[PDB]
Design a protein around this motif. Structure first.
Motif, PDB file in Angstrom:
ATOM      1  N   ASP A 149       9.241   1.757   1.409  1.00 36.61           N
ATOM      2  CA  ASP A 149       8.073   0.874   1.455  1.00 36.61           C
ATOM      3  C   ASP A 149       8.323  -0.577   1.048  1.00 36.61           C
ATOM      4  OD1 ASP A 149       5.534   2.902   1.873  1.00 36.61           O
ATOM      5  OD2 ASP A 149       7.133   3.821   0.688  1.00 36.61           O
ATOM      6  N   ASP A 150       7.771  -1.488   1.844  1.00 36.23           N
ATOM      7  CA  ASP A 150       7.869  -2.927   1.618  1.00 36.23           C
ATOM      8  C   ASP A 150       9.270  -3.538   1.496  1.00 36.23           C
ATOM      9  OD1 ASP A 150       4.962  -2.246  -0.123  1.00 36.23           O
ATOM     10  OD2 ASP A 150       4.940  -3.681   1.542  1.00 36.23           O
ATOM     11  N   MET A 151      10.240  -3.015   2.244  1.00 35.56           N
ATOM     12  CA  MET A 151      11.595  -3.574   2.195  1.00 35.56           C
ATOM     13  C   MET A 151      11.736  -4.703   3.219  1.00 35.56           C
ATOM     14  SD  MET A 151      14.066  -0.745   4.041  1.00 35.56           S
ATOM     15  CE  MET A 151      15.564  -1.695   3.687  1.00 35.56           C
ATOM     16  N   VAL A 152      10.665  -4.926   3.972  1.00 36.17           N
ATOM     17  CA  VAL A 152      10.610  -5.957   4.998  1.00 36.17           C
ATOM     18  C   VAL A 152       9.300  -6.724   4.849  1.00 36.17           C
ATOM     19  CG1 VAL A 152      10.177  -6.287   7.484  1.00 36.17           C
ATOM     20  CG2 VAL A 152      12.145  -4.997   6.744  1.00 36.17           C
ATOM     21  N   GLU A 153       9.364  -8.029   5.068  1.00 34.77           N
ATOM     22  CA  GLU A 153       8.186  -8.875   4.962  1.00 34.77           C
ATOM     23  C   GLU A 153       7.774  -9.276   6.373  1.00 34.77           C
ATOM     24  OE1 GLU A 153       7.204 -11.011   1.063  1.00 34.77           O
ATOM     25  OE2 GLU A 153       8.470 -12.437   2.163  1.00 34.77           O
ATOM     26  N   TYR A 154       6.943  -8.441   6.990  1.00 33.11           N
ATOM     27  CA  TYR A 154       6.475  -8.697   8.345  1.00 33.11           C
ATOM     28  C   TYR A 154       5.846 -10.074   8.475  1.00 33.11           C
ATOM     29  CZ  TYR A 154       7.301  -4.031  10.376  1.00 33.11           C
ATOM     30  OH  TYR A 154       7.858  -2.881  10.888  1.00 33.11           O
ATOM     31  N   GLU A 155       6.416 -10.852   9.387  1.00 27.85           N
ATOM     32  CA  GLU A 155       5.993 -12.209   9.683  1.00 27.85           C
ATOM     33  C   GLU A 155       4.529 -12.302  10.134  1.00 27.85           C
ATOM     34  OE1 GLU A 155       6.303 -14.641  13.499  1.00 27.85           O
ATOM     35  OE2 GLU A 155       8.385 -14.353  12.817  1.00 27.85           O
TER      36      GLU A 155
ATOM     37  N   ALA B 281       0.447  14.743  13.017  1.00 26.76           N
ATOM     38  CA  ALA B 281       0.822  14.078  14.271  1.00 26.76           C
ATOM     39  C   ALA B 281      -0.302  13.437  15.089  1.00 26.76           C
ATOM     40  CB  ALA B 281       1.641  15.024  15.152  1.00 26.76           C
ATOM     41  N   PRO B 282      -1.439  14.129  15.261  1.00 33.49           N
ATOM     42  CA  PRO B 282      -2.532  13.539  16.039  1.00 33.49           C
ATOM     43  C   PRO B 282      -3.413  12.558  15.264  1.00 33.49           C
ATOM     44  CG  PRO B 282      -3.192  15.657  15.316  1.00 33.49           C
ATOM     45  CD  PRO B 282      -1.718  15.546  14.981  1.00 33.49           C
ATOM     46  N   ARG B 283      -3.079  12.320  13.998  1.00 36.05           N
ATOM     47  CA  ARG B 283      -3.869  11.424  13.154  1.00 36.05           C
ATOM     48  C   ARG B 283      -3.141  10.213  12.578  1.00 36.05           C
ATOM     49  NH1 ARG B 283      -7.613  16.272  11.620  1.00 36.05           N
ATOM     50  NH2 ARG B 283      -5.634  17.374  11.222  1.00 36.05           N
ATOM     51  N   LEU B 284      -1.833  10.325  12.366  1.00 31.86           N
ATOM     52  CA  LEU B 284      -1.051   9.239  11.777  1.00 31.86           C
ATOM     53  C   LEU B 284      -1.132   7.851  12.420  1.00 31.86           C
ATOM     54  CD1 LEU B 284       0.850   8.182   9.638  1.00 31.86           C
ATOM     55  CD2 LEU B 284       2.760   9.018  11.015  1.00 31.86           C
ATOM     56  N   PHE B 285      -1.238   7.787  13.742  1.00 31.76           N
ATOM     57  CA  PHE B 285      -1.281   6.487  14.399  1.00 31.76           C
ATOM     58  C   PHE B 285      -2.618   5.758  14.374  1.00 31.76           C
ATOM     59  CE2 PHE B 285       2.933   6.214  16.895  1.00 31.76           C
ATOM     60  CZ  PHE B 285       3.612   6.716  15.796  1.00 31.76           C
ATOM     61  N   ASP B 286      -3.706   6.494  14.167  1.00 32.89           N
ATOM     62  CA  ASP B 286      -5.025   5.872  14.086  1.00 32.89           C
ATOM     63  C   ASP B 286      -5.101   5.024  12.816  1.00 32.89           C
ATOM     64  OD1 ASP B 286      -6.913   8.522  15.653  1.00 32.89           O
ATOM     65  OD2 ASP B 286      -6.654   6.454  16.353  1.00 32.89           O
ATOM     66  N   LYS B 287      -4.185   5.282  11.885  1.00 37.51           N
ATOM     67  CA  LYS B 287      -4.128   4.549  10.628  1.00 37.51           C
ATOM     68  C   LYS B 287      -3.122   3.397  10.656  1.00 37.51           C
ATOM     69  CE  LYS B 287      -7.285   7.026   8.649  1.00 37.51           C
ATOM     70  NZ  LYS B 287      -6.928   7.819   7.434  1.00 37.51           N
ATOM     71  N   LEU B 288      -2.150   3.465  11.564  1.00 39.07           N
ATOM     72  CA  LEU B 288      -1.136   2.421  11.683  1.00 39.07           C
ATOM     73  C   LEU B 288      -1.592   1.289  12.592  1.00 39.07           C
ATOM     74  CD1 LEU B 288       2.192   4.467  11.934  1.00 39.07           C
ATOM     75  CD2 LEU B 288       1.162   3.375   9.960  1.00 39.07           C
TER      76      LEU B 288
ATOM     77  N   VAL C  61       0.858  -1.225   0.000  1.00 46.76           N
ATOM     78  CA  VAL C  61       0.000   0.000   0.000  1.00 46.76           C
ATOM     79  C   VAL C  61       0.879   1.256   0.000  1.00 46.76           C
ATOM     80  CG1 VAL C  61      -2.116   0.981   0.997  1.00 46.76           C
ATOM     81  CG2 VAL C  61      -1.445  -1.364   1.578  1.00 46.76           C
ATOM     82  N   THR C  62       0.238   2.420  -0.070  1.00 48.60           N
ATOM     83  CA  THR C  62       0.929   3.703  -0.068  1.00 48.60           C
ATOM     84  C   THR C  62       1.173   4.146   1.386  1.00 48.60           C
ATOM     85  OG1 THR C  62       0.796   6.013  -0.850  1.00 48.60           O
ATOM     86  CG2 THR C  62      -1.277   4.954  -0.191  1.00 48.60           C
ATOM     87  N   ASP C  63       2.350   4.720   1.651  1.00 44.85           N
ATOM     88  CA  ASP C  63       2.710   5.176   3.000  1.00 44.85           C
ATOM     89  C   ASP C  63       1.718   6.161   3.626  1.00 44.85           C
ATOM     90  OD1 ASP C  63       4.469   5.550   5.359  1.00 44.85           O
ATOM     91  OD2 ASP C  63       4.760   7.548   4.499  1.00 44.85           O
ATOM     92  N   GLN C  64       1.186   5.776   4.786  1.00 45.28           N
ATOM     93  CA  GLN C  64       0.197   6.560   5.525  1.00 45.28           C
ATOM     94  C   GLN C  64       0.587   7.997   5.871  1.00 45.28           C
ATOM     95  OE1 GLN C  64      -0.084   2.199   7.009  1.00 45.28           O
ATOM     96  NE2 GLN C  64       1.455   3.636   6.220  1.00 45.28           N
ATOM     97  N   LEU C  65       1.870   8.235   6.133  1.00 40.86           N
ATOM     98  CA  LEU C  65       2.327   9.580   6.462  1.00 40.86           C
ATOM     99  C   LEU C  65       2.348  10.453   5.206  1.00 40.86           C
ATOM    100  CD1 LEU C  65       3.469  11.579   8.560  1.00 40.86           C
ATOM    101  CD2 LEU C  65       5.721  10.699   8.016  1.00 40.86           C
TER     102      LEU C  65
ATOM    103  N   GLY D 295       2.120 -10.481   8.904  1.00 42.04           N
ATOM    104  CA  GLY D 295       1.271 -10.037   7.809  1.00 42.04           C
ATOM    105  C   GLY D 295       1.091  -8.546   7.586  1.00 42.04           C
ATOM    106  N   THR D 296       1.347  -7.744   8.617  1.00 41.63           N
ATOM    107  CA  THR D 296       1.197  -6.284   8.556  1.00 41.63           C
ATOM    108  C   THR D 296       1.910  -5.617   7.364  1.00 41.63           C
ATOM    109  OG1 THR D 296       0.971  -6.256  10.981  1.00 41.63           O
ATOM    110  CG2 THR D 296       1.394  -4.133   9.902  1.00 41.63           C
ATOM    111  N   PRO D 297       1.246  -4.626   6.730  1.00 40.69           N
ATOM    112  CA  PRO D 297       1.793  -3.890   5.580  1.00 40.69           C
ATOM    113  C   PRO D 297       3.022  -3.095   6.021  1.00 40.69           C
ATOM    114  CG  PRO D 297      -0.587  -3.631   5.718  1.00 40.69           C
ATOM    115  CD  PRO D 297      -0.127  -4.178   7.036  1.00 40.69           C
ATOM    116  N   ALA D 298       4.183  -3.447   5.483  1.00 35.97           N
ATOM    117  CA  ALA D 298       5.421  -2.774   5.852  1.00 35.97           C
ATOM    118  C   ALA D 298       5.714  -1.427   5.186  1.00 35.97           C
ATOM    119  CB  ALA D 298       6.598  -3.717   5.678  1.00 35.97           C
ATOM    120  N   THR D 299       4.862  -0.435   5.444  1.00 34.29           N
ATOM    121  CA  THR D 299       5.059   0.914   4.902  1.00 34.29           C
ATOM    122  C   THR D 299       6.188   1.575   5.704  1.00 34.29           C
ATOM    123  OG1 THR D 299       3.418   1.881   6.411  1.00 34.29           O
ATOM    124  CG2 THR D 299       2.636   1.091   4.280  1.00 34.29           C
ATOM    125  N   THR D 300       6.823   2.617   5.162  1.00 31.76           N
ATOM    126  CA  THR D 300       7.939   3.259   5.880  1.00 31.76           C
ATOM    127  C   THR D 300       7.559   3.795   7.254  1.00 31.76           C
ATOM    128  OG1 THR D 300       8.126   5.672   5.475  1.00 31.76           O
ATOM    129  CG2 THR D 300       8.454   4.219   3.587  1.00 31.76           C
TER     130      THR D 300
END
Ligand SMILES: CCCCCCCCCCCCCCCCCC(=O)OC[C@H](COP(=O)([O-])OCC(O)COP(=O)([O-])OC[C@@H](COC(=O)CCCCCCCCCCCCCCCCC)OC(=O)CCCCCCCCCCCCCCCCC)OC(=O)CCCCCCCCCCCCCCCCC
Ligand SMILES: CCCCCCCCCCCCCCCCCC(=O)OC[C@H](COP(=O)([O-])OCC[N+](C)(C)C)OC(=O)CCCCCCCCCCCCCCCCC
Ligand SMILES: CCCCCCCCCCCCCCCCCC(=O)OC[C@H](COP(=O)(O)OCCN)OC(=O)CCCCCCCCCCCCCCCCC
Ligand SMILES: CCCCCCCCCCCCCCCCCC(=O)OC[C@H](COP(=O)(O)OCCN)OC(=O)CCCCCCCCCCCCCCCCC
Ligand SMILES: CCCCCCCCCCCCCCCCCC(=O)OC[C@H](COP(=O)(O)O)OC(=O)CCCCCCCCCCCCCCCCC
Ligand SMILES: CCCCCCCCCCCCCCCCCC(=O)OC[C@H](COP(=O)(O)O)OC(=O)CCCCCCCCCCCCCCCCC
Ligand code: HEC
Ligand code: HEC
Ligand code: HEC
Ligand code: HEC
Ligand SMILES: COc1c(O)c(C)c(C/C=C(\C)CC/C=C(\C)CC/C=C(/C)CC/C=C(\C)CC/C=C(\C)CCC=C(C)C)c(O)c1OC
Ligand SMILES: CCCCCCCCCCCO[C@@H]1O[C@H](CO)[C@@H](O[C@H]2O[C@H](CO)[C@@H](O)[C@H](O)[C@H]2O)[C@H](O)[C@H]1O
Ligand SMILES: CCCCCCCC1=C(O)C(=O)c2scnc2C1=O
Ligand SMILES: CCCCCCCC1=C(O)C(=O)c2scnc2C1=O
Lengths: 385, 55, 93, 74, 62, 246, 62, 110
Positions: F170-176, D66-73, D1-5, F178-183
């Motif tokens: 992005d995706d330089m790691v394959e999380y065991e 900052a107050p929103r990035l973690f709700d997506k991670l 997917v695309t980076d959340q930040l 399953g989680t999407p490994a975004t930066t």
């Protein structure tokens, strides 16, 4: 008579803690003394237990503290208690000192009481500093370097005293090991000094907020003040607990979690918060020798107060001009501290210089002038001729 | 409060009863706290992570 | 024991004060007093009084020092921004 | 997917406030490259940069993300 | 007694080395820096010294 | 002091471990360890962490044993005196990529990647700083910045010029798990794992704190009541003066 | 004034319908204080003593 | 009597102090002495061997032992000093005795 009175050992305890006649009106400001004894005990106890796991060698000091933090059961509690305890020791000492300033506790016949207290303050500063050097972090090394160099200001022999203190070419393995030995010793000298402080207090007793005699209405230390002391002891512990468990590093410096490095001094050095006001005073004098002399004088000037207070009554309770200026002095002290945490930059350097002036002027000019004026005002407001 | 006068009857609580109560308190309190604490952090603990793991 | 120096405090029975006469004190056992709860309604509006008389001696010196600090700080910020690099070269060295 | 930040930063660089900030930074970058092409840029001891303007942008972004990035991670 | 290989040090760069536990600074100065150093009046210095009294080869500040 | 010198202030991210009643997220610690092994360990040591401390925290006793054995450590000399190696055991400390400081600099343009064992406590900003630094590399430095050869620009680092390039993509790691490994997901993970490395007592410390604060609070309130009772006779005491006749 | 005429204490005195009211409260307070204090002392003592037990880094099973 | 009893306590504290100092050299005698004296406590029924592993801070006389012994060797002398003061306080109330064993109240000198 009661056994507590006749026994050689118990009578001492009886006269100082049980039957001691206290002025019925003393307030919670008089509770700081006991709090200071408690602090002294907490520092000694936690220190001895950590000493069991600590290595003073320069190659092992830093790691041995990490060893206390990671491997020793309840080790982090011991270190955070000892470290945060030192800070609390100073917060309480300043309040003890300020209380004395405000109520004229330094006045006759308690001059000896006040002078011994100044000596204790100096010994405490020396103790905390030596302890600070034992961690051997970045701040430790440079602090050990700066404070020992303070002596090079002495003409002729100065640089010799320094190489002597170091035990070599620079702050090294002979330095930190002697600093540990010394950090262990001094607290027991403070204890002995605390006993002399109490002996001097016992001959005339405590003063009170009204500033007048307490001889017409006293109540026993036992029960009344033992239980009142308990109130602040618990409050003191609650707050210390909050820092120890919830915010252990707020009163410290991140640079001390980095091992000392002889070749690199941190880009931003901010000393211990309780030394900041003195650091600012030092920094404000563009001369080496005069810089250290003025700093030391910032402490010794406390000795002058019994002579420059020209008033005829003890304390600031019934004095409008003195109360006002008392607080100018307090906030000026806090300001000096804030300046100490800033960089040597434009508005700050001049502010630091003026605040330093104000600090010394309080003792040497303001107090004698104001107290004289107040004496006269008190007179002409009632005499009808 | 007559609830007090039934157990101690106009006298204070004695050291023995204090010490005894202290030992009881120490155990009960610790369980109550560890419980509430672990429940509050459900999903974050190793216990919870170990279950979602299979090796 | 050895003779002791004269002080301004004695002990029970010879405290050192002046001879008292005419004064009569009265007290009631803490046991016979209303359990701690009456420190409200009667002792609430009376409180806070011992700070309405003092806050000025604390507030004014505080205020003075707060504005002095805020002023010098805002000036520092300006001096080190782009807009003030000109005045900075003037006041600096 | 695309980076959340990066996703949230992009979303904010396009608000009325973010555009105003990228503009001020842009106007600075522009003014700078013109100064570099002119003769004697190497010797000037007054070379302007757009760090200050960049920091304002970054700060605005940080404040919003900052107050929103973690709700997506996770 | 410490030896430093100057041929290795770049142009306008600062290098630090240990000698008796004390840090030794070594800067390979640029032509402009060399002029700045030797174009200063003694009245502006609290400890009066010409750049010449301090360096043997103007290229190396040690 | 100029903003470029101080460095851009790191903002406040909502870490799950922030708050008096919060423990670390051990799943995040686990993932973070992987990111450290697969990315960071190439240049960063973790000298103060012992294999055994991972057991029951982020990995099982078995998993850690397997991980430690992939590395060799100096064993005690044989019956004749010649040196010999040996696989790793739980008692050992996680090994670093370099044998000495000089070799560490040689492999990094002359820079020294610091040990990460205490990094979170050794920098103002803590977690917020580490995360922000890792995810704050712009593709291009701001206009006018004369970036030295071999350096990189990052606004959060003091002076802007850092010797570490961006290493998370992005995706330089394959999380065991399953989680999407975004930066950002990876930065969020290592940082959490690095926080645990520096403060392993964290979860336990906060539990003990809750007990300590409840008892002391109660003791404090109780003492006030006791004090007032013990003082009531003096407090309500009353005087009357009747001038003695001459 | 006559010393036999005791001043007013009405505002302080509890209307004695329950004589052992203040006593029960005071004694409970003192008792709870003693209970929690002993528990704390026990925990503190145990914290220091257990710090002398074998450290985590020395319990190696050879 | 009080004067004599405090003196007995001092004697015990002195023995403990010298012994701990002896262990700090960490020679052959040091190690075995540290081993024997700490084992003296295993004689206590039930918990005895526990007090011992506690005192050692491990499986045997090792690095946690000698380091705590040094810390302790430094501490105890200051306790002896305080005890010496109590000894003197007890001596001061009745004064010294004399070789005749009788009162000294009829002829004293400063
Ligand atoms: C990053 C920076 C962080 C900063 C760190 C903070 C520093 C902490 C280090 C030291 C902490 C321990 C020190 C405790 C004592 C210090 C306070 C003191 O001496 O004030 C005396 C002062 C004198 O009182 P008094 O004239 O003798 O009292 C008449 C009482 O009403 C007579 O009444 P009473 O005996 O019958 O009962 C008295 C009273 C007694 O209450 C007490 O505990 C004693 C006085 C404490 C007042 C609160 C201080 C705030 C500290 C935080 O009990 C009460 O009901 C009052 C409750 C007050 C609220 C306390 C806060 C609860 C917070 C929970 C967390 O008490 C005050 O009025 C406090 C003024 C505020 C001064 C703050 C300056 C310090 C900075
Ligand atoms: C005695 C009177 C006290 C005076 C002290 C007030 C100091 C508060 C200063 C605020 C500040 O900027 O602290 C910065 C300092 C350090 O700022 P600094 O170290 O981050 O600045 C540059 C460094 N880098 C690049 C790494 C970010 O914080 C402390 O160490 C002190 C904070 C606690 C103060 C304790 C007061 C409690 C009473
Ligand atoms: C350590 C304590 C050692 C206790 C001394 C042992 C002993 O045998 O004491 C006997 C003593 C009886 O003496 P006594 O009854 O007073 O006189 C005989 C008849 N008239 O009985 C006593 O002395 C009993 C006293 C017990 C109290 C011991 C400790 C009280 C703690 C406060 C010490 C105060 C002195 C501080 C000195 C300065 C320290 C730096
Ligand atoms: C080497 C130098 C040593 C000396 C330096 C002094 C150190 C600095 C001191 C720091 C804080 C200590 C402040 C102490 C408070 C003053 C002491 C005191 O005794 O105050 C009494 C006063 C009112 O008392 P009173 O006149 O009796 O009230 C009427 C009843 N008749 O009480 C009051 O009016 C209310 C109390 C006001 C408290 C203001 C505290 C400001 C402190 C800022 C903390 C720093 C934060 C960072
Ligand atoms: C160390 C400080 C922590 C102290 C822990 C407090 C102990 C809780 C008190 C429980 C009360 C028990 C009771 O009923 O006693 C009745 C007993 C007699 O009662 P009565 O017959 O009704 O008069 O009273 C006492 O002796 C109370 C003694 C309390 C001693 C606590 C120490 C307070 C001073 C603080 C300063 C310390 C630091 C200096 C170094
Ligand atoms: C002898 C010691 C006298 C102490 C008097 C009673 C003190 C009350 C302490 C309350 C603490 C408590 O309940 O902790 C539970 C808390 C948790 O209990 P645990 O789960 O059984 O380990 O224990 C501790 O961590 C206690 C040790 C730290 C105390 C921090 C507060 C500052 C006071 C330090 C006093 C040290 C004096 C030497
Ligand atoms: C080698 C190619 C590296 C990899 C892979 C990672 N890091 Fe690094 N890091 C490296 C260097 C050369 C430096 C020095 C930077 C300097 O200018 O001094 C660093 C530094 C850090 C720091 C400290 C920064 C500071 O505030 O002083 C951190 C916090 C850091 N590195 C973290 C980090 C992490 C978590 C990594 C994996 C995700 C990582 N680094 C990889 C070189 C290299
Ligand atoms: C040996 C007994 C011992 C005594 C007595 C002692 N300390 Fe320490 N202290 C240590 C040791 C060991 C350290 C190093 C461990 C640490 O950092 O806490 C230390 C460290 C310190 C530090 C550094 C805290 C930090 O940030 O890590 C300070 C400050 C300090 N002591 C203050 C005091 C004060 C003030 C007293 C007494 C009034 C005192 N110490 C008494 C042993 C002692
Ligand atoms: C610079 C002064 C100074 C310092 C520092 C000092 N004291 Fe005091 N102390 C005094 C004065 C003056 C009094 C008399 C107070 C009064 O009666 O007005 C006093 C009184 C006391 C009291 C009586 C109760 C009270 O708080 O008024 C105790 C107990 C006490 N001090 C303990 C200590 C201890 C313990 C230390 C530190 C280790 C200490 N003091 C350090 C000045 C000092
Ligand atoms: C087991 C007993 C005991 C020990 C050990 C002891 N004392 Fe004594 N001490 C006494 C007695 C009993 C006296 C009274 C002597 C007399 O008057 O007959 C005494 C008297 C003294 C005197 C008075 C002068 C003299 O020698 O008679 C001094 C001084 C003294 N002791 C110092 C010390 C010191 C210092 C220590 C050790 C650190 C110490 N004592 C240990 C029993 C002891
Ligand atoms: C006239 O007015 C007064 C007043 O006079 C007094 C006394 C008080 C009450 C306060 C006090 C008496 C404070 C006194 C404090 C002290 C005497 C502290 C002395 C300090 C010490 C540090 C003692 C030294 C301790 C040790 C040598 C032992 C600690 C170490 C141990 C136990 C190691 C154990 C080892 C192992 C292996 C188990 C007032 O509140 C007051 O107000 C009106
Ligand atoms: C530092 C370590 C702290 C350890 C714990 C703190 C000390 C707790 C002491 C607890 C109980 O100690 C206990 O106190 C109560 C007074 O409240 C005593 O009570 C005594 O006085 C009360 C009050 O006038 C009488 O009613 C009672 O009949 C009498 O026996 C009781 O006999 C004693 O046994
Ligand atoms: C009364 C003594 C006051 C101490 C003043 C010295 C303060 C002080 C410095 O001046 C300094 O340059 C450094 S570098 C690391 N720590 C310090 C420090 O504490
Ligand atoms: C009062 C205490 C007397 C101490 C008696 C222990 C004496 C003692 C032993 O019994 C022993 O086996 C060894 S091995 C090395 N040193 C010793 C030693 O001092």
């Amino acid at each position: 008579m009661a056994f507590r009175k006749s026994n050689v050992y118990l009578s001492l305890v009886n006269s100082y803690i049980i039957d001691s006649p206290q002025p019925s009106s003393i307030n919670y400001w008089w509770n700081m003394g006991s709090l200071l004894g408690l602090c002294l005990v907490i520092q000694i106890v936690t220190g001895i237990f950590m000493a069991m796991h600590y290595s003073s060698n320069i190659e092992l000091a830093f790691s041995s503290v990490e060893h206390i933090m990671r491997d020793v059961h309840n080790g982090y509690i011991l270190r955070y208690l000892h470290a945060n305890g030192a800070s609390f020791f100073f917060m309480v000492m300043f309040m003890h000192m300020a209380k004395g300033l405000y109520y004229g506790s330094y006045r006759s016949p308690r001059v000896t009481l006040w002078n011994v207290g100044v000596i204790i303050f100096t010994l405490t500063i020396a103790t905390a500093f030596l302890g600070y050097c034992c961690v051997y972090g970045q701040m430790s090394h440079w602090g050990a370097t700066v404070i020992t160099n303070l002596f090079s200001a002495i003409p002729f022999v100065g640089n010799d005293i320094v190489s002597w203190l170091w035990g070599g070419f620079s702050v090294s393995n002979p330095t930190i090991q002697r600093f540990f030995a010394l950090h262990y010793l001094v607290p027991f000298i403070i204890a002995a000094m605390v006993i002399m402080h109490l002996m001097a207090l016992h001959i005339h007793g405590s003063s009170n907020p009204l500033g007048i005699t307490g001889n017409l209405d006293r109540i026993p230390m036992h029960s009344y003040f033992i239980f009142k002391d308990l109130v602040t002891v618990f409050l003191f512990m609650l707050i210390l607990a909050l820092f120890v468990f919830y915010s252990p590093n707020t009163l410290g410096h991140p640079d001390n979690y980095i091992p000392g490095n002889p070749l690199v001094t941190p880009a931003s050095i901010v000393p211990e918060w309780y030394l900041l006001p003195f650091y600012a005073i030092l920094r404000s004098i563009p001369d080496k020798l005069l810089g250290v002399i003025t700093m030391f004088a910032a402490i010794l000037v406390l000795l002058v107060l019994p002579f420059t207070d020209r008033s005829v009554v003890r304390g600031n309770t019934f004095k409008v001009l003195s109360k006002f200026f008392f607080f100018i002095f307090v906030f000026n002290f806090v300001l000096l501290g804030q300046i100490g945490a800033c960089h040597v930059e434009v508005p700050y350097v001049l502010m630091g210089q003026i605040a330093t002036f104000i600090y010394f002027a309080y003792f040497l000019i303001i107090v004698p002038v104001i107290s004289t004026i107040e004496n006269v005002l008190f007179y002409i407001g009632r005499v009808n001729k | 409060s007559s609830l007090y006068k039934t157990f101690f009857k106009r006298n204070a609580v004695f050291v023995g009863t204090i010490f005894a109560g202290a030992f009881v308190f120490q155990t009960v309190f610790d369980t109550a706290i560890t419980s509430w604490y672990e429940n509050h952090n459900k999903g974050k603990l190793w216990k919870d992570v170990k279950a979602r793991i299979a090796a | 024991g050895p003779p002791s120096g004269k002080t301004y405090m004695g002990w029970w029975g010879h405290m050192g004060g002046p001879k008292q006469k005419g004064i009569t004190s009265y007290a009631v056992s803490p046991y016979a007093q209303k359990p701690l709860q009456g420190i409200f309604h009667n002792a609430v509006f009376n409180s806070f009084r011992r700070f309405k008389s003092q806050f000025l001696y604390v507030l004014i010196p505080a205020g003075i020092y707060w504005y002095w600090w805020k002023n010098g700080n805002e000036y520092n910020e300006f001096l080190y921004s782009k807009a003030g690099r000109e005045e900075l070269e003037r006041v600096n060295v | 997917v695309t980076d959340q930040l990066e996703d949230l930063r992009e979303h904010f660089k396009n608000t009325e406030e973010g555009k105003a900030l990228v503009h001020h930074y842009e106007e600075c970058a522009e003014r700078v490259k013109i100064q570099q092409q002119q003769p004697g840029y190497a010797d000037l001891e007054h070379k302007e940069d757009c760090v200050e303007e960049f920091f304002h942008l970054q700060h605005y972004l940080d404040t919003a993300t900052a107050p929103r990035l973690f709700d997506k991670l996770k | 007694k410490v030896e430093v290989n100057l041929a290795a040090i770049p142009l306008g760069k600062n290098v630090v080395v240990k000698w008796q536990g004390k840090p030794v600074f070594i800067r390979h100065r640029t032509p402009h820096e060399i002029q700045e150093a030797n174009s200063v009046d003694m009245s502006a210095l609290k400890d009066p010294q010409t750049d010449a009294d301090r360096v043997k080869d103007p290229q190396w500040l040690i | 002091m100029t903003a470029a010198e101080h460095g851009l202030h790191a903002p406040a991210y909502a870490w799950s471990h922030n708050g008096p009643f919060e423990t670390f997220d051990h799943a995040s610690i686990r993932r973070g360890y992987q990111v450290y092994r697969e990315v960071c360990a190439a240049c960063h040591s973790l000298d103060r962490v012992a294999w055994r401390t991972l057991v029951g925290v982020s990995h099982t006793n078995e998993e850690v044993r397997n991980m430690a054995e992939e590395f060799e450590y100096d064993d005690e000399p044989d019956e004749q005196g010649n040196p010999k190696k040996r696989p790793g055991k739980l008692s050992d400390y996680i090994p670093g990529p370099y044998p000495n400081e000089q070799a560490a600099r040689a492999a990094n343009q002359g820079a020294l990647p610091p040990d990460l064992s205490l990094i979170v406590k050794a920098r103002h900003g803590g977690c917020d700083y580490i995360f922000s630094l890792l995810t704050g590399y712009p593709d291009e430095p701001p206009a006018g910045v004369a970036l030295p050869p071999g350096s990189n620009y990052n606004p959060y680092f003091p002076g802007g010029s850092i010797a570490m390039a961006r290493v998370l993509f992005d995706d330089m790691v394959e999380y065991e798990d399953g989680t999407p490994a975004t930066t950002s997901q990876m930065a969020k993970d290592v940082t959490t794992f690095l926080n645990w490395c520096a403060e392993p007592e964290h979860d336990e410390r906060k539990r003990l704190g809750l007990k300590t604060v409840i008892i002391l609070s109660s003791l404090y309130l109780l003492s006030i009541w006791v004090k007032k009772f013990k003082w009531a006779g003096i407090k309500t005491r009353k005087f009357v003066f009747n001038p003695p006749k001459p | 004034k006559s010393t036999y005429r005791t001043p007013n204490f009405d505002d302080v005195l509890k209307e004695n319908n329950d004589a052992d009211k203040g006593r029960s409260y005071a004694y409970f307070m003192v008792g709870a204080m003693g209970l929690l204090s002993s528990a704390g002392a026990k925990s503190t003592v145990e914290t220091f003593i257990s710090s002398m037990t074998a450290t985590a880094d020395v319990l190696a099973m050879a």
